[PDB]
Design a protein around this ligand. Sequence first.
Ligand SMILES: CNC(=O)c1cc(C(=O)NC)cc(-c2ccc(O[C@H]3O[C@H](CO)[C@@H](O)[C@H](O)[C@@H]3O)c(C)c2)c1
Length: 158
Amino acid sequence: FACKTANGTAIPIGGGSANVYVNLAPVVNVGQNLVVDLSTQIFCHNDYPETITDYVTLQRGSAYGGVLSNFSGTVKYSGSSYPFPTTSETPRVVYNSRTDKPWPVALYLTPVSSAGGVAIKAGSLIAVLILRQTNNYNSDDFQFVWNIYANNDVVVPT
Ligand SMILES: CNC(=O)c1cc(C(=O)NC)cc(-c2ccc(O[C@H]3O[C@H](CO)[C@@H](O)[C@H](O)[C@@H]3O)c(C)c2)c1
């Protein structure tokens, strides 16, 4: 089991860390959602699908910078949503193919009432997402750590 990103970086067998850079809607109103879709950013596969079933969770999702200060919301993982920043570990998603498959994670972030002006700065860290991979074969328990950076400013209108 290993993963790759939309910026040409990777994390091998055994886990590790990678940076991910996301284009964000430049204007988000209070009462509306900024959607940060990582399923177009992070992809993984199973290296022995004939024999091994891989299990993948979102173990933890943390907010940073302007997201920490200026937003609240949820994280959607494989069709169900949970509070973000996270308060538990999600259920497992199965990976059962050698073919790249997206990691089905998306943030739904809505501005807090005091947000206004530039609420997320270009280049800043906005989140860290921990993917936990296990399997039905041995005792491997690996963390794939995804550091999520904004490519651009996000403004909350006054
Ligand atoms: C003597 N030979 C053999 O023992 C052996 C023959 C084959 C083989 O015949 N393949 C066609 C494949 C394998 C193989 C590959 C990857 C692998 O582990 C990696 O990949 C797994 C599946 O993604 C992850 O669960 C795991 O955490 C890790 O990342 C493990 C445990 C075993 C071994």
